[PDB]
Structure 1
Amino acid sequence: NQFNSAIGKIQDSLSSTPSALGKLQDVVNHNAQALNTLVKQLSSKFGA
């Protein structure tokens, strides 16, 4: 019974809105931001 209750309660804590999976969100965030900087910087005169 204790095992079943704990397995049940895992899902609620995961579903709580705090950043439980921030460690996996940061990967997509870093990638998207790096590519976006690369494209946005293609519009600079650099002294031209």
Structure 2
Amino acid sequence: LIANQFNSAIGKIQDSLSSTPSALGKLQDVVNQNAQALNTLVKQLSSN
């Protein structure tokens, strides 16, 4: 019984991750913020 519950839970984990697209936002936001900072720095070259 414990073996079947464990295997079923792992399979539900992988296809739930495969379905929901907004799962990894904790990582993604980090990347976004860094890129966004660099972006503003570049356009500060175009100010008088």
Superposed pair shares fold, TM > 0.5: yes
What runs of 5+ residues in structure 1 fail to find an aligned partner? none
d(CA) in 1 for partners of 2:20 and 2:10?
19
What runs of 5+ residues in structure 2 fail to find an aligned partner? none
How many pairs are equivalent? 44
Please report how far the alpha carbon of residue 15 of structure 1 lies from its aligned counterpart in structure 2 after TM superposition: 1.2
Query: TM-score, length-normalised on structure 1?
Result: 0.82
Determine what percentage of the aligned residue pairs are the same residue: 98
The superposition leaves residues 6-47 of structure 1 with CA deviations (integer Å, 9 ceiling, x where unpaired) of 011100111124310001000100000000110011101xxx
In angstroms, what is the RMSD of aligned CA positions?
1.0
Q: Which stretches of structure 1, 4 residues or longer, exceed 4 Å deviation after superposition? A: none
Query: TM-score, length-normalised on structure 2?
Result: 0.82
Q: Please give the secondary structure, in 1, of the residue aligned with 2:20.
A: coil
